[PDB]
């Protein structure tokens, strides 16, 4: 089997991407944030504290003939940005782009933090990291990909995120028309539960590539590219007027600047992030100061290849017995 679904930016900055997911019988379609940096599929629901719902589409398990309450089970998650949610657990039939999983754990939110309430476009998350990070208690549950894996033609999914445009998540096959040149594959560590890999270095603009190992995670649920302070300083040093602002919370630059590209290494291959991808617009409405899309990971504890990086590539998440990541230009 295979699946193929279009993913769409939630706003003009590509802050996140949403993908329609069918849940239950008859189908209830919710727009979920596919997150390769977490492993819970959770949704706004009929159980979500009413004051914490503001425009989201909710899952109503009592209207689904295939919903089943997982007795006694609970879940509770916190994300890198400090956001959080929690609730109880159903299983139900879940389909993504034509690919159906029966008995998928669908985690129903009782509580969500303010950032989720305030984002009316995101109806929940669909985690695609390894199932060892799943937060269901007392018994951890499997991700959609994990459940689907044995049915798939090939044990893979791919992320093809667009720059200010829709893209695609495919399950079970590699679309050889979706990228240029070849896919370079690189080793993954699952020790922390993430799609963790080691980049072979970087270049700033037309500069010579610096060969240096950069451990980090491929994370579709993070907006920006977070890298060591050394790397990030070398980048913004090439932008006239750029500076790190503690009050704003990172590197800012004059909106009139022409940003250099940023290259990261995948083995002997190279992915080039165009300068425009690194512009996240005015720091506040009407400001001539703009926020940078490459920021320091110091204090996160890990480097994060978020959407800024991933959308410059066609990315293969290979969930074979020994997982790997593939990157191609496109």
Outline of this structure?
The protein has 330 residues and is mostly beta strands. The chain has 2 domains: 5-174, Acid Proteases (Cathepsin D, subunit A, domain 1), CATH 2.40.70.10; 175-330, Acid Proteases (Cathepsin D, subunit A, domain 1), CATH 2.40.70. The protein is built from 4 helices and 24 strands.
**Number of helical runs?**
4
The CATH superfamily of the largest domain is Acid Proteases
The second-level CATH architecture of the largest domain is: Beta Barrel
| Backbone CA Rg | 20 Å
Strand/helix succession:
EEEEEEEHEHEEEEEEHEEEEEEEEHEE
The CATH topology of the largest domain is what?
Answer: Cathepsin D, subunit A, domain 1
Kindly give the count of domains: 2
Q: Please report the distance between the alpha carbons of the first and last residues.
A: 25 Å
Domain Peptidase A1: 17-328
Organism: Cryphonectria parasitica
GO molecular function: aspartic-type endopeptidase activity
Family: Belongs to the peptidase A1 family.
Give descriptors for this structure.
330 residues, mainly beta, Cathepsin D, subunit A, domain 1, 4 helices, globular
Tell me about this structure.
- With 330 residues, the protein is mainly beta.
- It has 2 domains: 5-174, Beta Barrel (Cathepsin D, subunit A, domain 1); 175-330, Beta Barrel (Cathepsin D, subunit A, domain 1), CATH 2.40.70.10.
- The protein is 7% helix and 44% strand.
- It has a 7-stranded mixed sheet with strand order 18-17-12-13-22-14-21. A 6-stranded mixed beta barrel has the order 2-3-8-4-7-6.
- Strand 1 (3-9) and strand 2 form a beta hairpin.
- The protein is globular and about 60 Å long.
- The PDB classes it as hydrolase.
- The entry lists the keywords fragment screening, aspartic protease.
């Amino acid at each position: 089997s295979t699946g193929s679904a279009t993913t769409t930016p939630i706003d003009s900055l590509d802050d996140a991407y949403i993908t329609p997911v069918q849940i239950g019988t008859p189908a209830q379609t919710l727009n979920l944030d596919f997150d390769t940096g977490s492993s819970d599929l959770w949704v706004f629901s009929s159980e979500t504290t009413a004051s914490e719902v503001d425009g989201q589409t909710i899952y109503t398990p009592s209207k689904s003939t295939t919903a089943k309450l997982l007795s006694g089970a609970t879940w509770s998650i916190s994300y890198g940005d400090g956001s959080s949610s929690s609730g109880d657990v159903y299983t139900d039939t879940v389909s993504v782009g034509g690919l159906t999983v029966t008995g998928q754990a669908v985690e129903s939110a009782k509580k969500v933090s303010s950032s989720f309430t305030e984002d009316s476009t995101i109806d929940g998350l669909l985690g695609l990291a390894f199932s060892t990070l799943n937060t269901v208690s007392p018994t951890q549950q499997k991700t959609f990909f994990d459940n689907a894996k044995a049915s798939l033609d090939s044990p893979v999914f791919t992320a093809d995120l667009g720059y200010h445009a829709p893209g695609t998540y495919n399950f079970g096959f590699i679309d050889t028309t979706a990228y240029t040149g070849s896919i370079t594959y690189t080793a993954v560590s699952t020790k922390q539960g993430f799609w963790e890999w080691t980049s072979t270095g970087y270049a700033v603009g037309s500069g010579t590539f610096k060969s240096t190992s950069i451990d980090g995670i491929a994370d579709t649920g993070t907006t920006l590219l977070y890298l060591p302070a050394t790397v990030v300083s070398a980048y913004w040093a090439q932008v006239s007027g750029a500076k790190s602002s503690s009050s704003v919370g990172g590197y800012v630059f004059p909106c009139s600047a022409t940003l250099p590209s940023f290259t990261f290494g995948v083995g002997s291959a190279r992915i080039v992030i165009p300068g425009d991808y690194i512009d996240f617009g005015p720091i506040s409405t009407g400001s001539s100061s703009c926020f940078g899309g490459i920021q320091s990971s110091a204090g996160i504890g890990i480097n994060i290849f978020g959407d800024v990086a991933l959308k410059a590539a066609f990315v293969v998440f290979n969930g074979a017995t020994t997982p790997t990541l593939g990157f191609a230009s496109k």
